[PDB]
């Protein structure tokens, strides 16, 4: 038996095991239901509603469909490597193989649904990122943050957009908050918050100076619609000001960016992707009510986990990787992985992290 055979088998367990745990019949029976609902034309009478079926098609589809491909991938794949071992053709071997890998990796990331027991793992999500403290170095880092986080998403399929970005004075930014939509975005990003450490030689500084820079990730989900429980105004400061556009600043000089802040916690959320000032609140008014919702999440989370009388309560503000690129090598901090290609992981790999942050169940 050709060790490749071994691994079809391999495989085909693998997601006989997955189409039990996550309830094939079941979502395929709510695949049929959803369609139904979102062919009507008056379905868009309520917004709100047809995009949370849209959502959700979304996310049965990543496993009905997803499945399906997989009964007929692997049986493609046997049948052409038979028919590559019997006619000694190299290439049709390594052409099924390569497939077989596409395939495996599609599995793979389908088992990960185990591990989103959150009650909004499959939520869309935001991300904020904040320069540190270290002038232009602290900058150019967040926005080397972005640029890996962005495409990291886009390499997951997620949607982004860029919410809110405000540039630093001379390079890089000093803050950015990113939507990034998707199946189960929020269980597949909310292990990168925290603080991101960078050392290297700064290409700012005239000499070649080692230079530690931080940079903060926070990642909260969207509830909108799924939590009604609305701010009240009075605990609301709502600034409308100027954002930063490609040279149009005609409308775009008084702007019409919407800035909120919740004077009982001092948290600010920010929109000014949309050219209407009244969509840029309505936005950013999304935001803070996840925000809110998440810091509540978290006071809720410490209850669970509350033993020792007097005890510090879990901030989401520790260092959680380190990216020494002198040395050419990141670390998380958390989980001990590592890895010596450090241009790959700016380039947006991270799943070897992510991966390894959900299975020590973080």
């Known amino acids: 038996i050709n060790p490749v055979n071994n691994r079809i088998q391999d495989l085909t367990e693998r997601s006989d095991v997955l189409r039990g745990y996550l309830d094939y019949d079941a979502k395929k029976e709510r695949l049929e239901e959803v369609n139904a609902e979102l062919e009507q034309p008056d379905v868009w009478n309520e917004p709100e509603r047809a995009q949370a079926l849209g ?9 009905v469909d997803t499945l399906d491909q997989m009964k007929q991938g692997l049986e493609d794949v046997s049948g ?7 006619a000694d053709d190299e290439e049709t ?16 990331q389908l088992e990960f649904r185990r591990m989103f027991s959150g009650e909004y793992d499959s939520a869309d999500c935001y991300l904020d990122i904040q320069a540190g403290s270290g002038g232009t170095e602290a900058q150019d880092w967040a926005s080397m943050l972005e640029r890996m986080y962005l495409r990291w998403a886009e390499s997951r399929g997620f949607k982004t957009e860029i919410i809110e970005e405000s540039e630093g004075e001379v390079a890089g930014i000093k803050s950015v908050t990113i939507k990034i ?31 530690t820079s931080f940079s903060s990730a926070f ?16 605990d609301l400061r709502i600034d409308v000001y100027r954002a930063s ?19 009982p916690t001092g948290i600010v959320t920010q929109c000014q992707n949309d050219r209407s000032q009244h969509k840029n609140k309505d936005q950013a008014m999304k935001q803070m009510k996840a925000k809110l919702y998440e810091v509540e999440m978290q006071k809720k989370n410490a209850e669970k986990q509350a033993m020792e009388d007097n005890k510090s309560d879990i901030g989401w503000g520790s260092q959680i990787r380190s990216y020494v690129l002198d040395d050419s090598r990141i670390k998380d901090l958390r989980t001990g992985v590592e890895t010596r290609n450090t241009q790959a992981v700016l380039d947006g790999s991270l799943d070897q992290f992510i991966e390894a942050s959900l299975k020590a169940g973080l």
């Open 245 to 263: 556009g490609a040279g149009g600043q005609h409308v775009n000089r008084t702007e019409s960016a919407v800035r909120i802040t919740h004077i």
């Open 181 to 211: 939509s998707g199946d189960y975005a929020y269980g597949w990003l909310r292990t990168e918050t925290g603080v991101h450490r960078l050392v290297r030689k700064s290409p700012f500084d005239s000499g070649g100076r080692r230079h």
């Open 93 to 108: 071997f390594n052409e099924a193989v390569a497939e077989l890998d596409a395939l495996e990796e599609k599995l793979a």
């Open 80 to 86: 052409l490597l038979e028919l590559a071992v019997e």
């Open 219 to 234: 990642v909260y989900p969207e509830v909108d619609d799924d939590i009604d429980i609305e701010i009240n105004p009075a």
């Open 55 to 63: 959502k959700e098609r979304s996310s049965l589809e990543a496993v």
